[PDB]
Structure formats: structure tokens, C-alpha cells
């Protein structure tokens, strides 16, 4: 579970992302596609060239969903209800890929927020993304 400390750390760290949310999401995706090519199997319909409108756009959707999550961290199953439905019934992304994007999201944050990415915050963020991932996969079966 996310502790109160986790919740403060995530709000602090992600609050700092602020208006870069889009850019960071896009970068996290690009990192994932390049580091973990099997993930590209879910986006055969995307221009996956560096800087594509599609990736930059999906980056923002992902980041905004995260901002949503952070905003309602105490009630994530409800805040992500439509999205978990979307992943469960339509997209059907195998759960293992959530760990791949989550890791690339951490790497992204680490690269952009040198001051904010402390060991304790790194830990909280990792638990946070893991918890979001759990919500997003909670309705798969």
C-alpha cells in the first residue's frame, strides 16, 4: 500500500513534472520502445519514429492519467476506473509490460529531476507506478 510518506513523496516529485508531463511521458515511451522492443507490438499502428505526433500525444495522455492518479492517490481504483476498463477489455496489454513502462518512467524522472530523485523518493515512485499498474490490470480476469 502507499504510505502517507509515499503519497507526500509522489505528490512532491510529480508536482515538479508539472507542465513537462507531456514531454516526459513521450520520452518514457521512446525509452521503452528502444530498450524493450517487444513493447512495440502494442503499437504497430503508430509512427514510432523519434518525435512522432502520435508518441508525443500518447505521452501526454499517459502523463495526464498519472497526474490524475497522483491527484486522487487515496482513491486510485475509482479515479482510474474507465482506464482500467479500457486496458482490461480492449487494449489487453500483457501485465508484464507495465513494469517495463514503469521502469522507463522512473529512468525519465531520474534524468530530469536530479534534486528530487532521492533514494526514498525513488522507492515511493516505484511503489506508486507499481500501484497504478495494479489498478490498470485489476479487471483483466
Amino acid at each position: 500500500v502507499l504510505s502517507p510518506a509515499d503519497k507526500t513523496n509522489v505528490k512532491a516529485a510529480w508536482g515538479k513534472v508539472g507542465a513537462h508531463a507531456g514531454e516526459y511521458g513521450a520520452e518514457a515511451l521512446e525509452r521503452m520502445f528502444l530498450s524493450f522492443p517487444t513493447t512495440k507490438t502494442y503499437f504497430p499502428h503508430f509512427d514510432l519514429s523519434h518525435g512522432s505526433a502520435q508518441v508525443k500525444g500518447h505521452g501526454k495522455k499517459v502523463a495526464d492519467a498519472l497526474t490524475n492518479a497522483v491527484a486522487h492517490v487515496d482513491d486510485m481504483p475509482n479515479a482510474l476506473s474507465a482506464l482500467s476498463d479500457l486496458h482490461a477489455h480492449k487494449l489487453r496489454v500483457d501485465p508484464v509490460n507495465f513494469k517495463l513502462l514503469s521502469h522507463c518512467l522512473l529512468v525519465t524522472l531520474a534524468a530530469h529531476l536530479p534534486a528530487e530523485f532521492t533514494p526514498a523518493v525513488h522507492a515511493s515512485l516505484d511503489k506508486f507506478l507499481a500501484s497504478v499498474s495494479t489498478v490498470l490490470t485489476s479487471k483483466y480476469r
Binding site: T38, R92, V93
Partner: protein, 146 residues
């Protein structure tokens, strides 16, 4: 990968008893029941709405035959699994866009089906041998992804 001589012998021995058509359909069907998100690749296959529907689906049965046929053929080449499945690997990536994680799931379901079908004869040593085999086929099938 890297089966011992005796593991090779256990695989060969059990596989002599396997009805590849029957087992392929059973395993592919269970994949879609136990991990329903895997149905995402089988939109055209018709009725997948219930377990009995998935298991009795002729298109699932048909594909099951082919899939486990290819598996069976690869058992003749346990030392060269990458080369054996390179063409199918390229297929699954470039044309079918199948997450190789699916190969691992099928492998594990196939292990459950062998255990279910053969009972005590599917001993822990025979299971170990099959676990190496399915991990190797999954790896061989994932190898040409890019």
C-alpha cells in the same frame, strides 16, 4: 535450453504418447480461458464468450493443431531451437504483432495440460525437462523481434 541427455530422453518418450492435434487445441483453448487478454489476437475466430465456447471453437482447435505441430517439429531439433523457429519468430513479430510474453504463457499452460492429461506419469523430473523445452521454444520464437 541445454537439456541433459536424460531430459531429452524424457521429452521424446512422453511426446510419443501425445496426440498433438488434441493437445494443441486443449492448450490453445486453455490459454484463452485462463489468460483472456490473449484473445486480442483472435478477433476473427468467432465465439470466445464462455469457456465451453472457447474450448469447442473449431478455429481455436484448428490453430492449436498448427501451433503444437510446429512445436512438435521443433522437438526434433532441441540443439538448434533459434534456427528452427527463426522464420516463425519473424512472422510473429512483423506480421502478427504478438508480444513474446504470450509464448511463455502458452508454454506454462501446455505444461499444465500435459500434467492434467498424463497424471502421475508427468513426474517432477519429466516436468523439469519440459520446462526447459518450453522456455527454449519461447526464447527461440522471441529471438527475431526488433
Amino acid at each position: 535450453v541445454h537439456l541433459t541427455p536424460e531430459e531429452k530422453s524424457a521429452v521424446t518418450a512422453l511426446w510419443g504418447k501425445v496426440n498433438v492435434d488434441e493437445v494443441g487445441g486443449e492448450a490453445l483453448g486453455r490459454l484463452l480461458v485462463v489468460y483472456p487478454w490473449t484473445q486480442r489476437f483472435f478477433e476473427s475466430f468467432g465465439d470466445l464468450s464462455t469457456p465451453d465456447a472457447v474450448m469447442g471453437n473449431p478455429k481455436v482447435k484448428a490453430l492449436g493443431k498448427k501451433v503444437l505441430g510446429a512445436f512438435s517439429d521443433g522437438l526434433a531439433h532441441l540443439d538448434n531451437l533459434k534456427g528452427t523457429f527463426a522464420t516463425l519468430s519473424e512472422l510473429h513479430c512483423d506480421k502478427l504483432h504478438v508480444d513474446p510474453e504470450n509464448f511463455r504463457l502458452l508454454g506454462n499452460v501446455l505444461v499444465c495440460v500435459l500434467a492434467h492429461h498424463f497424471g502421475k506419469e508427468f513426474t517432477p523430473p519429466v516436468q523439469a525437462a519440459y520446462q526447459k523445452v518450453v522456455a527454449g521454444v519461447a526464447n527461440a520464437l522471441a529471438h527475431k523481434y526488433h
